[PDB]
RNA sequence: GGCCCAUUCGGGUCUUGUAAUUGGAAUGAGUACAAUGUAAAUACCUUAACGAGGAACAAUUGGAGGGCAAGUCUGGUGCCAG
RNA sequence: UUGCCGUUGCUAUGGC
């Protein structure tokens, strides 16, 4: 059973966003399991599962803890506006390939 | 003078480091971080709460309604209580039984509701340290802890298990073993208004759990003897005390760092301090804690000390040397075996082998001005801490509790200026860890409740 | 390289029982006797100058 | 396993160096692409063939 | 590290024989490394003695040196004098390593059993599994050397030999 | 590659953002990317500070001015629409840009040092300031180094602060950069080290230039609010 | 029976050996699920599955000394010396 | 008011 801890929750009205640091705790598990972590984050906060996102995962030595960077949006459309395209390729729906020449 | 030169050179050093009040006094980085402080959320859990309940001299002391409800369980060990924002209490014994009480009928003795008794039936069929997932206690339940929300009680003892029982039925919902051979739990404390438990296990270890997720958060290491007591408040700090290493540590649990506080009273300098014009001495083992607020706490020792410690001083702020008396010396008909009283008196060596009572229970009411100490002197003591927070002082005594006090905690009633509390104290005739206790002087295994007023 | 020094130290401390007399740990059980002989002619003590 | 690619690379280079002079050229060709080898690799292979400085034999 | 002056005299060879056999060392490089940095330590403490009382260097670097030597654990709490740093020597330093300490605490039956426990990761001081044998445990990490909870000598699930024998005996 | 005024942490990058041209100089301003991204941290990178600049939250000096490297110099009131953010940024005592938070009736104006008064063309009196607000028609008694108060809805001067002996002055320049206290001394030389001198906690003395100092109010009553500690 | 000293005779000492049998535990190199990381990929970190008896899953380098044949060569005062 | 047992109160105590 994974365990979740949010810390230092601030609000960004300019980016319509709420951001925090994510202490993810998995004793006798491998690692963070980021999609399941987005599920757990989207249910501890409000619904917006295609508007919650995590990117900066570092597991400490020997496992157990990992610190990530969590940012949760309202309004999935403006989340699609404000998130970068590589994270949208990683998690959500966007896929535009670069033209392979030279 | 070498220490004078050390102090002088350290002062010059700090002056030089400063080298490398006006009308304008504003610093850009400080005010930017204060803008981020105005931007952030969650001013809820992390209150550095000071002492906001100044009521020590206010309430009455000497005429409490003291009911010592004796129960038929050998050597009660712990007491857990609960208040929402009807009140239940919990006791547990060395006879492997948990017992639920109702306590909310305030003017009278508590009411038994439900047993939950483990026994020899719950010994595991493996003797293997990770299939310890049975549903009951087979050895020596040492501590209970009620949830701050009241869905669960969680208990554990020398069978190295944490069994979490439901409140409404006293049923084991989940079993979490501590996965090693010496992993006996000795103290449990929820952080206040939460679902997070801090257990202190004799592996020099502190385990943390989230109870409603059935998960373990963090194991944190660092004491040097068994972590005999634990204490927590609404902050994610914690305060533990290991027994014989004579240090109390407090843990930033997310950072996994600590502040250590050693003791350090010596009878040489103490008897010289009295010699400038006396039966007091060094320290055995720091035993019990309770975090009074988020800047101070208090420790109960093995030589009867009660000490008051701040968050900003390694050495303690205040001591109180003898807090429950010195024990009655062993009789001349039970020391020597000679015939004459002169030689049987010579076998007492005067005052050299008088040992003090050791405080085996201490409870600070959270953020309040008053704490309660208990041992087998027969009389609980009530002390209030002065409003400048650099001393405490004995208010009164509660003399209706014959036996060892294995647990003290209080139950609140009344509003902001008019209040009444019932002090529960588990009374046994045997210390909560080993036996060690002779001269059982009229003790009974009961619950000493007192109703204090105003 | 580790097992070689484990087994040339065991050889060395078996040779040390030959040159000196090594304190083995005192009297084990009942004092049975000297088990190897007593020489009344040999004196293994260091004379001065 | 690029790890085992590098390991077997080094082992083949050393075993080849015990059979030819110590400091002969072992060349590494990648996978075949469209019927023949990558022309970058064949270009600098021909660069290795172009400077070889032959020494006269006896028979 | 650095090699000694006369590296092949018979006293030095019997010295290294006794040290490597009594502490389970693999070669001479363990002794030479720990003795090289001990040489730096007490070559510094010699100069701290050759300067006088109430010298600033002597006062501050002397109590700094003896306090971090006490916290490494080679020097006891009561001898807070600077000549004990000169009396210090090499096996006082390699009694502090984790192989020696695992054997002395009795989690292993010899120093070689301790070395293979450490390199097979059954030993964790504090939180982390330590896996190199020459670790130099400190006076606060002296009492949390225990079996790792990820290991069958702790309380964990038994290893591949035990479970394969159990499966084949179940067949 | 950075200046000292920006309060810029060294563990940031390699290329430092040159501000673009604008009202103030390069050496006495901070752009919006070093303002929003890495000082009060409304962004995390250049992409999203360009995103909120395209969204147009910024309202510096009452106009939007959507640009990354827009050189906000002295006391340009940065206005942000969400959470009614009104920021007047001044100098602290050790050279950086202390960004004080103010309210709406204070961000409804700014002040500016007058640089020169001209009979430019066609009989029109004329005034410039450090953001270059060429506003029409002040009184004839506008000397150099006095202080106009800009309207910030239109552009007109609303109030005027005369530079003389006994006025509350702000020093931006040289080795006195960012001090307040304005009275130990007055000394006007004839070409250099000419000034009004500024006190300290023990009322110490200081030397600067005329152009490196400019007035903000009176002895106890500036209508600018100032941060404290 | 091993070991130690000593130019010699000899002396000192003591649980020591053996390609003897045998037992269950341990895991690491390797083989590999992944997830994390990252524009992407590698690598680090975390990590289920398999992985040892010649544990052949087969580390070297250099030194000291022998001993053997229906063998070969040389010398010469048998059977010897080299 | 309890594992027994005694005084019990018509509730408090004290021996294992």
Curated annotation (Swiss-Prot), chain B:
SMART domains: WD40
InterPro entries: Rrp9-like, WD40/YVTN_repeat-like_dom_sf, WD40_repeat_dom_sf, WD40_rpt
Single GO BP term: endonucleolytic cleavage in 5'-ETS of tricistronic rRNA transcript (SSU-rRNA, 5.8S rRNA, LSU-rRNA)
Cellular location(s): Nucleus, Nucleolus
Principal subcellular localisation of the protein: nucleus
One Pfam entry name: WD40
UniProt KW Calcium keyword: no
Repeat positions for WD: 136-175, 180-219, 222-261, 281-319, 355-393, 400-446
GO CC term, one of those recorded: small-subunit processome
GO molecular function: snoRNA binding; U3 snoRNA binding
Keywords for the protein's UniProt record, in alphabetical order: Acetylation, Coiled coil, Nucleus, Phosphoprotein, Repeat, Ribonucleoprotein, Ribosome biogenesis, rRNA processing, WD repeat
Note on domains (UniProt): The WD domains are required for nucleolar localization and U3 small nucleolar RNAs binding.
Similarity section: Belongs to the WD repeat RRP9 family.
PANTHER family tied to this protein: U3 SMALL NUCLEOLAR RNA INTERACTING PROTEIN 2 (PTHR19865), U3 SMALL NUCLEOLAR RNA-INTERACTING PROTEIN 2 (PTHR19865:SF0)
Subunit field text: Interacts with UTP25. Component of the ribosomal small subunit (SSU) processome composed of at least 40 protein subunits and snoRNA U3.
Misc note: Present with 5130 molecules/cell in log phase SD medium.
Protein name as catalogued: Ribosomal RNA-processing protein 9
UniProtKB/Swiss-Prot annotation, chain C:
Highest taxon listed in the record's lineage: Eukaryota
Compartment list: Nucleus, Nucleolus
Biased composition, class Basic residues, residue ranges: 1-18
Function: Primarily required at the G2/M phase. Essential for viability: involved in nucleolar processing of pre-18S ribosomal RNA as part of the ribosomal small subunit (SSU) processome.
Subunit structure and binding partners: Interacts with snoRNA U3. Interacts with MPP10. Component of the ribosomal small subunit (SSU) processome composed of at least 40 protein subunits and snoRNA U3.
Similarity comment text for this entry: Belongs to the SAS10 family.
Miscellaneous comment in the UniProt entry for this protein: When overexpressed, has a role in the structure of silenced chromatin. Overproduction causes derepression of gene expression at both HML and HMR, as well as at the rDNA locus and at telomeres.
Protein name (database record): Something about silencing protein 10
Gene source species: Saccharomyces cerevisiae (strain ATCC 204508 / S288c) (Baker's yeast)
Gene name for this UniProt entry: SAS10
Region of the whole protein represented: 561 to 609 of 610
From Swiss-Prot, chain D:
Function per UniProt: GTPase required for synthesis of 40S ribosomal subunits and for processing the 35S pre-rRNA at sites A0, A1, and A2. Controls access of pre-ribosomal RNA intermediates to RCL1 during ribosome biogenesis by binding of RCL1 in a GTP-dependent manner and, via its affinity to U3 snoRNA, delivering it to pre-ribosomes. GTP-binding and/or GTP hydrolysis may induce conformational rearrangements within the BMS1-RCL1 complex allowing the interaction of RCL1 with its RNA substrate. Required for RCL1 import into the nucleus.
Subunit comment: Interacts directly with RCL1 and the U3 snoRNA to form a stable subcomplex. Component of the 90S small subunit processome also known as 90S pre-ribosome that consists of the 35S pre-rRNA, early-associating ribosomal proteins most of which are part of the small ribosomal subunit, the U3 snoRNA and associated proteins.
Family, per entry: Belongs to the TRAFAC class translation factor GTPase superfamily. Bms1-like GTPase family. BMS1 subfamily.
Annotated region (G5), positions in chain: 29-38
Superkingdom in the source lineage: Eukaryota
Locations listed in the record: Cytoplasm; Nucleus, Nucleolus
Shown residues within the full chain: 179 to 237 of 1183
Identification of the protein by name: Ribosome biogenesis protein BMS1
UniProtKB/Swiss-Prot annotation, chain F:
Cross-referenced CDD domains: KOW_RPS4, S4
Purpose: Component of the ribosome, a large ribonucleoprotein complex responsible for the synthesis of proteins in the cell. The small ribosomal subunit (SSU) binds messenger RNAs (mRNAs) and translates the encoded message by selecting cognate aminoacyl-transfer RNA (tRNA) molecules. The large subunit (LSU) contains the ribosomal catalytic site termed the peptidyl transferase center (PTC), which catalyzes the formation of peptide bonds, thereby polymerizing the amino acids delivered by tRNAs into a polypeptide chain.
Lineage: Eukaryota, Fungi, Dikarya, Ascomycota, Saccharomycotina
Further details from the record: Present with 573 molecules/cell in log phase SD medium.
Gene Ontology CC terms: 90S preribosome; cytoplasm; cytosol; cytosolic small ribosomal subunit
Keyword field contains Cell division: no
Subunit structure: Component of the small ribosomal subunit (SSU). Mature yeast ribosomes consist of a small (40S) and a large (60S) subunit. The 40S small subunit contains 1 molecule of ribosomal RNA (18S rRNA) and 33 different proteins (encoded by 57 genes). The large 60S subunit contains 3 rRNA molecules (25S, 5.8S and 5S rRNA) and 46 different proteins (encoded by 81 genes).
Recorded family membership: Belongs to the eukaryotic ribosomal protein eS4 family.
Residues that bear Phosphothreonine: 103
Location in or out of the cell: Cytoplasm
PROSITE patterns: RIBOSOMAL_S4E, S4
SUPFAM superfamilies assigned: Alpha-L RNA-binding motif (SSF55174)
PTM-bearing positions, type Phosphoserine: 20
Name of the gene encoding the protein in the UniProt record: RPS4A
Location of cross-link Glycyl lysine isopeptide (Lys-Gly) (interchain with G-Cter in ubiquitin): 50, 122, 149, 156, 162, 167, 199, 221
GO biological process, one term: translation
Residue ranges of domain S4 RNA-binding in the record: 30-93
